[PDB]
Amino acid sequence: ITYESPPGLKKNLMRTYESWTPEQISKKDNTHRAHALFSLAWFHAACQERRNYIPQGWTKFYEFSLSDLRAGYNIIDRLFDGAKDVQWEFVHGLLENAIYGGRIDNYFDLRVLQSYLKQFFIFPYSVSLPQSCSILDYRAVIEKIPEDDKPSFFGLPANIARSSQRMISSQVISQLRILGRDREIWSNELSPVLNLWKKLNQNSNLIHQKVPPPNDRQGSPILSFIILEQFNAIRLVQSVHQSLAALSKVIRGTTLLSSEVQKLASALLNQKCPLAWQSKWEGPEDPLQYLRGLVARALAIQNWVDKAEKQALLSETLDLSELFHPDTFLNALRQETARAVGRSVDSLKFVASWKGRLQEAKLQIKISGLLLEGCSFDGNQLSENQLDSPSVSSVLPCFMGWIPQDACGPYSPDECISLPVYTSAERDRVVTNIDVPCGGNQDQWIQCGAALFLKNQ
């Protein structure tokens, strides 16, 4: 017996209401009470069924138990058979602070739980036809719920199902393909890795064979950043070139094996990346795409040096795809603004905008090329996605600078929502959190789980 969650919505409600006993639900005081029990049932079912989409509805796979549900039933017992007029506030207050938020570490998943708890104390109205305290009508509305599920019941856009069914279909097809059925290193299971490297770096021998001087802090703190960037980049590139020259000579040449050669070979045969490469810089799990991103940044930082030797790094439009550590660049801008203004560094703020150039800031740099998901961006207004909405949407460019505190921000405080700015689609680490003008009804934009990725590739 496999002992798991039900695979669907109304399946989960049927399992739940089978697990109840009817003398519990059938109390004398009837009408306003069992509807809250149905709200708890729908809330438990919803929070469990969000887990099918990762990292969309939750960032990790959080463990929700039936003991949690029975604890919640104990809570609603002591509320409604408690005296009078149960505050809907503290139900979700104690519920978040003890039961379901006691699984959660990231803040934005707490925000999502806050939104469902605020929302469910009303439904998709056409599918929801609730009833009186008659128990078998609570059974029968579950059959009135349709077979197939919709993310419009949950809040996700419609391109989610497109990407999900493409990937799940390829998974089941490969799994049924399974049911039908040192020489490999001397063979060519790993030759296209070396082949992609020889295509990336055949006309950039300066870009893997030059040495920058080891440098200390110069005058402005934006020069030192880019010089250390250059040094780290050339160091990682030459380290990769050594680690591939060894495994090239043990195959297409005349030498013997070490153990680290076997480590590189084992990881690359399993097509994961070795831990020595992830010790320096986190990249994609594809080693091919890793080499791609690396050689791209290797070209980029030399161009960054060429246009930042003349202090012309204010005027030009630049892109944050090419920074190995972009928040350190932004904190370097924090130091240059705090030195140029004549105010201490702790008393600044970071606000970007879209409706024109920054007035009160010291410096203005044009940052574009961001990617967005979970919505469809426009100037001054966020618009909901559609059925045929494409997955990755480009964005209007932005103006970024550092603003002193207790000054007038370009956007009013109660019209915007903070969005994380991750690094790729894996949603691993947070760079910053920019505000975007919502214009009321923010809870939909919470439950979409909107994000913003610095780039891709």
Binding site: T2, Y3, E4, S5, M14, A161, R166, I173, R177
Partner: protein, 128 residues
Amino acid sequence: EWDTFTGVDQLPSWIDQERSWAVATLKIALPSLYQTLCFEDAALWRTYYNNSMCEQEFPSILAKKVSLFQQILVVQVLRPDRLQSAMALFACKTLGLKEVSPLPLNLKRLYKETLEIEPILIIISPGA
């Protein structure tokens, strides 16, 4: 059919490259359905390419020249945003099952079935 199913073009114009490579695969592999399909319709397939819940909006002119397994070959080449329900109704038609999902798991039901010759192995998962 099953091997090209599990993976073992200047003539079409209204489609994407991503589907066009699979069109080239289908054309080189199985030219018979390529002949029977008449891909230069742009009248019925324009309608099929735009329905939601497009598992049942099959062009009924060809409803007796295409088997159930060849419709899924059409679906995989045209639109892979349908394959899960396509497989589901394929299995539900060939086996008569009203759902591909099973029943739930009431242990009060499976109390009375067992017997003391063999024991009961309850496989767990995280959170169970």
